[PDB]
Design a protein around this ligand. Structure first.
Ligand SMILES: Nc1nc2c(ncn2[C@@H]2O[C@H](COP(=O)(O)OP(=O)(O)O)[C@@H](O)[C@H]2O)c(=O)[nH]1
Ligand SMILES: *CC(=O)NCCC[N+](C)(C)CCOP(*)(=O)O
Ligand SMILES: [Ca+2]
Ligand SMILES: [Ca+2]
Ligand SMILES: [Ca+2]
Ligand SMILES: [Ca+2]
Lengths: 163, 447
């Protein structure tokens, strides 16, 4: 007797402080004020279990050897719309995916969209950059819960479409 | 000829808390099996896996090993196909069953092909995964034995001569996948990857009579002393420390003709002895750390932990922790960096979560002697004596070479049950002495 139809492993990557844990906490526990959470969703009749990891820069502390050669099904690259430096590093985060990781699904998220008086990363430029790479783009707010659900749901749908 | 593939083994794996008062003989008997095709090919398969505090009711061994012995048109043994697989993941019986299915089927498809190793790999590859170390060897007229070797993942193949001097090593590989993560290549990844030669290690070697070929999954060789061979930006090549590996065979130097089982047993004993010491050290270190109540002493980093132990005279405990964290003392593939500040809670969450051990498998193969195998066929197929007897005029250099061949045959041992728990392996002579003596008198007369 199965408890789910699909198990998808999602990875959150990006500079420290952009809100990756808060996006995780908002999507799984609907809380806001912690680098792994689980949530099962339904999508086209299928029940999809999501295991979501915030890498949390643990690469800076240790190197590990996993038993699987397979990686995550999808990677969400997060930046902070109030921090141009966090956006500038996105190209480096994406190169670490392309250089090493088998046609993984990607999504680009600009978090903290509620801080509209501090928003300095132009979403038009971020959208066009993501479109040039075939990567969907969303602006989110973990604080306001805006587009948080839609981001993880859209990633899950894109993975289901490529299977 | 004979085709043997190990079966799925399921054992009750006691926790480290209950194995802590266990000697090595008891540990081996509870966890290991032997499969013996003949004097010259043997498999030891088992599990050293264990949780620190909980018993594993159904611990499925996710490795597989197999062999197909090939012959020439006269039925004389002249080669073999050997494969060992390591199912990735697991350790849920439903999930374990699916991983074992791919591990077992990958081994059997390699054995069942009648192709060279490159064509065979193309046929058996074209979302569960298994790594594989495998080889094929065959006698070629005018050329002798040639062996084709392939390794995909972190299994290991070592080739030795009849005096146990190392000749070659087919090293284990890890591929860097970014974010501080290394992964062993899998056979199924070899089918869904753009770059093939990065995941596959290939070697072709001349082999001599009496050479010893040892294949191991990481559950065995990873417990021995290991050595980093090379590390590029994308690739890590690993093997056993060759100076340490030779000291294992010091136990066999006076044996005229040790069975493959004897060779495999010596290596398994040493690997599991070290594994048993490691798991006892680990749970001892965790208890000594928790006894200090560092949370109530404002000790929040590993460096503060090490300094606390050095200042209180328990420098040995400090050095043990450093070895585990910074030198990967447990052979888990986890290495912390030395020039950073590491939170204690991150390490404690790591240490208390770690299992110890793994599925552990080794196969040992001896490259047969040409004359011995001609005699074996002459004894086993008396109906073909008219075809086989003329071949002795080209395989016998002297009556002394004949005598040496009959001496090796008299030492051969077989396990009629083929498979058994390791503490229940029963061996008997492959041949009766009256059979060999009658055969040797006939050939000496015909000479
Ligand atoms: N205004 C606002 N602040 C946020 C949002 N998401 C995260 N933060 C802030 O970011 C800090 C924590 O970010 P965190 O989730 O730990 O980032 P991480 O290091 O990438 O995991 C908190 O102090 C929050 O106030 C958001 O959507 N809106
Ligand atoms: C405690 C635990 O189960 N950790 C997961 C590691 C998986 N083990 C149990 C080590 C089996 C191996 O994975 P791969 O190296 O074949
Ligand atoms: Ca975080
Ligand atoms: Ca491994
Ligand atoms: Ca395995
Ligand atoms: Ca293994």
């Amino acid at each position: 007797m199965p408890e789910y139809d699909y198990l998808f492993k999602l990875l959150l990557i990006g500079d420290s402080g952009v809100g990756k844990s808060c996006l995780l906490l908002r999507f799984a526990d609907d809380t806001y004020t912690v680098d792994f959470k689980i949530r099962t969703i339904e999508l086209d009749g299928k029940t999809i279990k999501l295991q979501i990891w915030d890498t949390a820069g643990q690469e800076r502390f240790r190197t590990i050897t996993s038993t699987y050669y397979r990686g995550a099904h999808g990677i969400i690259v997060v930046y902070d719309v109030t921090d141009q430096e966090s956006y500038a590093n996105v190209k480096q985060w994406l190169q670490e995916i392309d250089r090493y990781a088998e046609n993984v699904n990607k999504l680009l998220v600009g978090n903290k969209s509620d801080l509209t008086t501090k928003k300095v990363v132009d979403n038009t430029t971020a959208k066009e950059f993501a479109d040039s790479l075939g990567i969907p783009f969303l602006e989110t707010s973990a604080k306001n819960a805006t587009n948080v659900e839609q981001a993880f749901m859209t990633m899950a749908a894109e993975i289901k479409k490529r299977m | 000829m004979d085709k043997i593939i190990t079966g799925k083994k399921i054992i009750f794996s006691q926790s480290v808390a209950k194995d802590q008062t266990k000697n090595l003989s008891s540990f081996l008997s509870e966890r290991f099996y032997s499969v013996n095709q003949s004097h010259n090919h043997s498999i030891i398969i088992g599990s050293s896996l264990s949780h620190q505090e909980n018993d594993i009711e159904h611990d499925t061994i996710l490795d597989t090993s197999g062999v197909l012995v090939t012959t020439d048109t006269n039925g004389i043994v002249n080669g073999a196909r050997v494969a060992i697989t390591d199912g990735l993941g697991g350790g849920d019986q439903e999930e374990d069953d699916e991983i074992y299915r791919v591990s077992h089927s990958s081994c059997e498809n390699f054995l069942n092909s009648d192709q060279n190793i490159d064509t065979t790999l193309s046929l058996i590859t074209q979302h569960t995964e298994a790594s594989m170390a495998a080889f094929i060897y065959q006698n070629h007229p005018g050329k002798g034995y040639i062996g084709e070797f392939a390794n995909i993942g972190d299994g290991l193949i070592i080739i030795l001569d009849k005096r146990f001097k190392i000749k070659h090593m087919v090293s284990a590989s890890h591929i860097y996948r970014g974010f501080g993560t290394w992964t062993p290549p899998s056979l199924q990844a070899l089918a869904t990857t753009a770059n093939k030669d990065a995941l596959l290690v290939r070697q072709t070697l001349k082999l001599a009579e009496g050479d010893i070929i040892i294949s191991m999954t990481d559950g065995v060789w990873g417990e021995l002393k290991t050595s980093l061979i090379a590390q590029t930006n994308d690739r890590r090549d690993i093997g056993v420390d060759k100076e340490y590996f030779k000291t294992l065979f010091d136990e066999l130097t006076d044996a005229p003709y040790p069975s493959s089982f004897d060779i495999a047993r010596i290596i398994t004993q040493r690997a599991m002895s070290r594994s048993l010491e490691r798991r006892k050290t680990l749970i001892k270190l965790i208890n000594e750390i928790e006894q200090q109540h560092f949370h109530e002493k404002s000790v929040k980093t590993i460096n503060e932990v090490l300094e606390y132990f050095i200042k209180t005279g328990h420098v040995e405990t400090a050095q043990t922790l450093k070895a585990i964290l910074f030198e990967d003392g447990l052979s888990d593939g986890i290495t912390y960096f030395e020039n950073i500040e590491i939170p204690l809670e991150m390490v404690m969450h790591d240490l208390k979560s770690r299992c110890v051990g793994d599925c552990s498998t080794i196969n040992v193969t001896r490259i047969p002697y040409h004359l011995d195998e001609l005699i074996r066929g002459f004894i086993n197929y008396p109906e073909k004596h008219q075809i086989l007897a003329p071949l002795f005029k080209a395989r016998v250099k002297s009556e002394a070479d004949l005598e040496e061949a009959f001496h090796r045959l008299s030492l051969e041992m077989v396990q009629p049950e083929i498979e058994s728990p390791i503490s229940e392996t029963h061996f008997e002579r492959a041949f009766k002495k009256e059979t060999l003596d009658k055969t040797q008198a006939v050939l000496t007369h015909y000479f």
